[PDB]
Symmetry: C4
């Protein structure tokens, strides 16, 4: 199967749907559910969440599923086995707190040349790839050979939606990373492509991405963009009892 | 083989024995030995004990066996790999302190969808399944396909026996959990049944259980209920030397 | 092959050598090298040492070998994975400090019923088997089916030699355990024999052992008892530099 | 294939190149890159670095490669799993900080008799083999059967180059071990040779090494010694941000 990997930038709303491949899985990440339409459908092969809000994002996802807004087969935490990027006890006990989820590093680390590439740049030059590229890496590790990209805009406004929602702002007041650049993401993608002999495509002709990655081919494809109503557009916050039970794992 | 899983509620004494299956193993738990008759015989396939009194329950079980009151092939601790529910060093060193026993989580965790179901409810909603359901899970993990239930009454008086015995009261003065409900147990059982394609039966027509789980079929079976005399009806307490050697493991 | 397992009691000097089996390996332990003659030859299949003096005993053994007093194929520490009986970092780093040696528990624990038997008696009743029985257990785990016993006297004077030597007394001033008894050793041996279908023999008709274990059969065997001269009859003490490097591992 | 293992002593500059074998890999270590000519070419099968400057040496190596001064297939840290010789968290997290590298002990420890030999001498007699011998051990573990030695001079002036360079002096001011001797290296090499049935050769007829190890045979071989210009002849120092991220791993 093919894969569409979506970041949450403005180009998520500017997909050229006639370039949509035949037979695909969808990878979403982070606040993807804040989208106001189902730009890539309700069905995800995998959804990825950062370690720092994983506890709350997992709780929110269970509501999304139960409420029939999305489904996903896989749930991933985008970790790296780096003490400066994630809580150590969180990673150690992960599978026992979230038994239907996965640590993304289980897959990321299978791409040894890329793990080395990522680590050398992060540790020594403070150049960090974004979640969108992380997802590409995990996809290549899972055996996907053709990867279709959208919503990756290099922070050139910020998101395809308003992320300033009250719960998210309470959890992470900063929503109102400096190691990210377009160059670091572009160079990382080019490395994955050549190193692992896979094909990258761009679904958004008007993204800055299209300056670097060739467009997916026109296939006359159609796609219905289902609207969303009374939907979940903020992260949910667990009870204090929940927090008390998870407190060894957050900091 | 089939399995009879027994909680210790009043319905343990109200089994309809003509509904007893042909060829069965018996699972018992906790203060089962306080029973005044051998409601399900002397022979257990497995006995389960909570982490919090496992040290004393293991010592007591060895007396039960030696004194020929019961036998059991397997000895299980009902743990979950959750820091808020069990002592970490207890679980880490378990097999070296109790080499003929098992951590139940070795089996529980093999039912990944159920481990996820249990964890999500416990951590986020403080809804906890009881030992009776835990035992069903372990049985399904061990390959049992037909499960016959008794002694599960949802705390609607408390036990099929008087648990206010002097040693148990000293160990756990509270015998004179608020996350338990009938709904949480019923919903967990229904989940196991549908998810793992197994069959649940109820041996006690007069239990509240029979409102939800269909009765085991009449088979004209007979069963002798052997009386108990001068039997062990309280937990035994180990010496202070024993405690001193186990003290890293209790709290 | 058969095995002769030797404790260091006075009966080590009272072996009936015409009862010596044809084709045997020898297991020695602890201060065996204090013997004044080669009562069982120079060649050991295995030598066992307690965790508490293992650092010094290992150093001493290397001198014994280099000086051509003994040889041994295997070197074992008699541990149990019990925090009250051995240092935890010693066991954790063992194979990296002593790469040609073995932790005896790697073998002991393969006899699950016996590990359980040992643990229940030690932890709950403070009844501990001696090194002589430990060695029998390790031998059964290694596949030996016929075990010939000597030097096991149940502390009924103390050793086949004078152990009051200056270095050993400095290391362990106490040489001038209360959980040991003849009953605990006899009951443990009887358990191994019946449980693992092996055969125990006694080489010393005049030991208290012969009250309980049948004598090995007369085979007309001969054996030369080589005398010892200018031999190593005290434990050696490592330099302070050595100690400083091992100090995380002793206490 | 054959292997040339090079220490960094003065004899590195006094190789008899007509004795160079046909088909070889090269092992280099530590400050090898300070060499003023490519005495053994630009291409390394493996380069080895001590744990204590590994962070900075790894960063430097990436510059060497990128700048096309050397290449190497393998990157090794020469560790021993000894708390007195390396940082414990460094070794524990190694593969996640340096995913394209190897801990040399993964290979060293496969030579069990030699690991035992090394450990007994280091721990008890403070006799330590040098990196040059460590590399021979790792080569034998990797299946190399014929080993050609150079640059091993036993500190009889110090290096084939001036190591007093400003960054290295800042990192390790001491460059302006007392457990090393020629005897300890010679005895360790003789042990490897006899124990593992491999062949040692010496490429430097004028080294003290040639007193002990027979010369590699004349094969009329030719070799071009490529000069070096504007090359990297000091270790590079990472930013404070880099250090802050690695600080749990250095001390
Ligand atoms: N303005 C944007 C916002 C997000 N993205 C991508 O979408 C991913 C999800 O957004 P976030 O900020 O949650 O990481 C992000 O990691 C980038 O890969 C982007 O490329 N440009
Ligand atoms: N009144 C009762 C008492 C016990 N039970 C069940 O029997 C199990 C053993 O009793 P206990 O309180 O030890 O957990 C308990 O976990 C329940 O599953 C019950 O269902 N109703
Ligand atoms: N008087 C004695 C002395 C030693 N032993 C045995 O020899 C073993 C070695 O002696 P020791 O005290 O070092 O454990 C000891 O563990 C016993 O098994 C004995 O049986 N009777
Ligand atoms: N004067 C010298 C310098 C280095 N060496 C060898 O080269 C190796 C690399 O040098 P160094 O000091 O970095 O360890 C060293 O471990 C020795 O094996 C040597 O043999 N004689």
């Amino acid at each position: 199967k093919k894969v569409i990997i979506a970041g949450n930038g403005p180009s998520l709303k500017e997909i050229d749907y006639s370039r949509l491949p035949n037979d695909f899985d969808v990878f979403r990440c982070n606040q993807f559910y804040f989208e106001d339409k189902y730009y890539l459908g309700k069905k995800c092969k995998a959804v990825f969440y950062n370690p720092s809000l994983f506890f709350e994002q997992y709780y929110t996802l269970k509501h999304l599923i139960q409420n029939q807004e999305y489904e996903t087969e896989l749930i991933m935490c985008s970790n790296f086995n780096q003490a400066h990027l994630e809580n150590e006890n969180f990673v150690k006990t992960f599978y026992d707190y979230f038994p239907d989820a996965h640590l993304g590093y289980d897959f990321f680390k299978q791409l040894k040349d890329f793990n080395a590439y990522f680590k050398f740049h992060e540790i020594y030059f403070n150049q960090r790839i974004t979640s969108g590229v992380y997802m590409c890496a995990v996809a290549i590790a899972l055996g996907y050979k053709e990867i279709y990209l959208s919503g990756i805009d290099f922070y050139q406004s910020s998101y395809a939606f308003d992320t300033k929602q009250k719960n998210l702002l309470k959890l992470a007041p900063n929503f109102k990373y400096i190691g990210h650049s377009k160059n670091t993401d572009i160079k990382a993608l080019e490395f994955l492509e050549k190193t692992y002999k896979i094909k990258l495509y761009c679904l958004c002709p008007n993204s800055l991405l299209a300056n670097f990655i060739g467009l997916a081919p026109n296939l006359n494809s159609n796609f219905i963009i289902q609207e969303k109503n009374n939907y979940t557009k903020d992260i949910l916050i667990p009870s204090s009892e929940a927090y008390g039970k998870f407190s060894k794992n957050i900091n």
